[PDB]
Amino acid sequence: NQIVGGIGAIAAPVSITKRVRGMRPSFRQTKGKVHIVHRELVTSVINLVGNFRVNNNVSAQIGQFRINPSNSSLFTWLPTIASNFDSYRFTSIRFVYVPLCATTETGRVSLFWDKDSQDPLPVDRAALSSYGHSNEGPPWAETTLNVPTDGKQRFVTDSNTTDRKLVDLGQFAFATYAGGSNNQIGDIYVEYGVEFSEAQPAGGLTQYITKSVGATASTTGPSYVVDANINVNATTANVEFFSPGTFLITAVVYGSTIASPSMAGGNGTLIGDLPVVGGSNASIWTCVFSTTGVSTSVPTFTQAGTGLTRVQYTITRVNSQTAYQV
Amino acid sequence: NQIVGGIGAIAAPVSITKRVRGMRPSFRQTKGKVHIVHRELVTSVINLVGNFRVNNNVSAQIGQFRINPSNSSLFTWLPTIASNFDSYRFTSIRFVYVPLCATTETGRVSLFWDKDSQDPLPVDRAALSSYGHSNEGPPWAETTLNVPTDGKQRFVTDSNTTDRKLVDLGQFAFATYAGGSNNQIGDIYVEYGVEFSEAQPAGGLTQYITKSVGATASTTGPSYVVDANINVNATTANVEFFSPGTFLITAVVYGSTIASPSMAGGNGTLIGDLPVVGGSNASIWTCVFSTTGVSTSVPTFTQAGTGLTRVQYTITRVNSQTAYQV
Amino acid sequence: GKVHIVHRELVTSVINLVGNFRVNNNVSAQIGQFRINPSNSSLFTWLPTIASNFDSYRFTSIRFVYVPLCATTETGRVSLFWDKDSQDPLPVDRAALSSYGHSNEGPPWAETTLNVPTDGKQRFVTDSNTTDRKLVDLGQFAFATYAGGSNNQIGDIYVEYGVEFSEAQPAGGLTQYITKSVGATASTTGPSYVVDANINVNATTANVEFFSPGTFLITAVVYGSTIASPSMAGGNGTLIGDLPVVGGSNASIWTCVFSTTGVSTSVPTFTQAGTGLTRVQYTITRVNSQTAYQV
Amino acid sequence: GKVHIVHRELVTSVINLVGNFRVNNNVSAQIGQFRINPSNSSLFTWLPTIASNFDSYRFTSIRFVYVPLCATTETGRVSLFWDKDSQDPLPVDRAALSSYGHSNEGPPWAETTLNVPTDGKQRFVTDSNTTDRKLVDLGQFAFATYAGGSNNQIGDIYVEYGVEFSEAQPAGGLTQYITKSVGATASTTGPSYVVDANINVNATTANVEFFSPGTFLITAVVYGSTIASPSMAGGNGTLIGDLPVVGGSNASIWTCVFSTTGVSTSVPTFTQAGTGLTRVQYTITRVNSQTAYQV
């Protein structure tokens, strides 16, 4: 209760941390608009040593916390009920950072908001500091930013909508530029109040991406993945995720002879059987698996093959007890 | 305005029909319970001549209007937002039948409610008349039934739950036993007010059924299909739907040599490409298509094959612009 | 500085089938295609001849009505609905359309209206370039029918609007330019009178039919080997002029003025035969009946 | 006619990893496995020795607490949540658990509680037969951890309940009967102390470890070719008795009394070698320390 002498001074403890409760969502209707407020987390920030890095990976994949109720990577409970509406408006939203490391962890972190959604995620240390809404902060003290709202209603991303910039409240991000260690530091909570209007039949929750050696990116659906998948001719069909959760996939390739997908030795763990067939001109392989984060080498599938023409996947989110013949 | 003589009598017009408007849903919260009232249709009743028939087909497939917010076959807008909750309660629900044929169409129809959900859908003409809640009626006049509610809260069917009888408000059905012609007659509207409680992460909307020559029915997910798919050894892998809408499928078989799926010549139309590969020991074929009703012979896929061991499908609901390489 | 017109015009007919579910009178539903926008010539038919002389608009109030045409003894359910973004996919079963917030069903022998809510913002008219075509529209309209018991025209739908244009652009015209070859389809240019459906390969195969009403002036060139004459009779649309034609060895050019009612049937409108063909072009304008090629 | 006990006991420890997301201290999460029910011996540890002498229950009030055990310098996030049906699937990423309506996170150096709401209906206790096991439970509890930076036990969780049993049944006991063969798994019978994870094939392979705390009495028979002695040392759990053993040609029977702390490590608890094996059986009871095989 009493800190030892002297008096009236600044004291630095070993750790400070708020304790949180999982409050329920609460609804409210008003003039045909349904209003819902809730709080959940997004991710936990991890730092490197001696290297600038933003959003837990070095490629940093522009977007990826695109603030929009259809985005599953940021909101984890909102988008499965936001697919019943075609318009929204944020009435209040703030990002809360709460630490979970000791005071002896070093490396000053930051989190910030941009208004558009294709500014290519800065690399210089000085370019981070000059956003209009940010918080410089040490990695052991809580920091919160508000992000300003509008009156304009936007759309809730049911189609491809390639100029995905007029329908977004902005973009959220965070970065670290010192350190330290290679541990978790804290986790970012977001609490928010939204509106919805003009109810709709339920849209899909299934991504369909295509990739040949060319146009990247002829995709549709909610971006569980984005254009980060490597194939040229060689032992090259690499898929890796960044969004957490557990998914149901189905793949189809084309070209010369192939091999089996070697998922072992990387992120994400099997849960079923993954039946596979092919090896002459095309092959199909479906699976179901869970994954956690994360940024690392030797990515999550490394389908080799010999000489390839096209590849295309379908991704959908599903629980545990949906796998194959167990 | 004035009917010709005589006066004070009963007059039979050529047709009577109400005109309806597509009212929006409306929400309300109260003590942590979200209350939503809405009206939509289910199907349109079609009759045969000289044969008793119930729910537009002769096999009649027990269940199939199982009154439960997870059932997509009855409610078409409710289940995509009812997958965010684990408990419900109906506060008011009635089924409204509105005619759309002339007075010269004959064959007296009926619709009724049962309290359990495995009574095997009667075949005798006399057994139809003695349900506790029903309406005998001619095919040209509107008839409505209420269905009584409880205070008991039930579950919203996120798992297999093989005794699917304690979690349902009952079962809805309708039948015709005379006629007439082979035309549409009317369509059944349902208006309803529900509650929900104890919000949840969004469950899946994807069915996974399995079938070998044996246990039927080792399934999961929302029953877009039910155990109606024929395979024994021979040119036998037949799938046909009854629920309307448009779907994304993926199939996988096992056994001896096979052939291509001949979807042409029946219900349901192609929309994409349906890539297919296999023909030695197993084969994969996915597709995407829309279908309307309906009960007829030569069912919707007739995958032939030569000698088969297992078959298993995955079904999910998705819009139009999701097909393959167009 | 802002004009303000009020008018009530025709959209299209409706055609039901024997007990299925169709949206906007075709299968596969053609995503979009009735995005409500003053340059969309496929739904308005008097408006876009003056919306080509402007750039912005704002619908101040708009309703869609449905008047009957059939006898009172014909079964049916017609429905009218409106999604507020232009490329959400259209529904595929009759169970889905109860979920739309602005819907109104009814029997095919009675009148049926619905409003559609507006907002005080201004948009653009040009749609040849905007991909996505999503923020330049006020919504998307579609009708659907689900019963028997015939294949006849059982009504039509009319709009009743009020617009506010501003800052005029010069009138480029209303002509189309529809090229086509045995391959990629179809590289249109202009308004959308007609359509990404005109069958032709190499055989007795050069077919064009319409689906919008009105009187028209078309020119067409063909290419390839020997071309036969266009026998327009037997299908929709009636000749009003002279139908001049020339050629038959490498190319054949022919103009026509006619009017079509739109409703369809088998054996489509023009149907040139030819012998072996490469490509075809079409220019379609809307113009009245006095401008006929005299004999 | 209705008894009413109030007690506060232990559930299990918690163990975090270096920056991943784990639920209930394993990967693949074992759907169910903490369904809160007075016969579920895997979470309660004093309650089900008297819930075997009843048939119905009603939790009148129940909360779950979490006390710390680690130093204040260790990073982490622990969380406690509750779904009200027993076989909704467990989440797989840390983003999902913000959506549960009854959740409470916190740092691993501070205390954390959560309530769980009750209702005035009575259920059953027996779970060996009810498929589905869904209406016989009051819910499903699970914890999760998502940070670094160690692999040490960083706390444990305790319940604090109040029950109302009624209409007693006769006490059958608390023994298990775990058969196993090189094939189908595993045909348990009784409470769930332990577990569908006990590795054995034919080689130096007959492994059983526990994950619940407490002191136990186990008997075991084996079959096959030559069996070696169980070398219990080196792993979790310490011997308290004499460990008698016999056999080594076709079968070997051996009893043991011990206690284990539950927390785990490598090199599991018993680990018989053997030479070539067919099947194995286990009977597990919970009993105190005075009943040791004397020397």
Ligand SMILES: [Ca+2]
């Ligand atoms: Ca949309």
Ligand SMILES: [Ca+2]
């Ligand atoms: Ca559930």
Ligand SMILES: [Ca+2]
């Ligand atoms: Ca201009």
Ligand SMILES: [Ca+2]
């Ligand atoms: Ca008993």
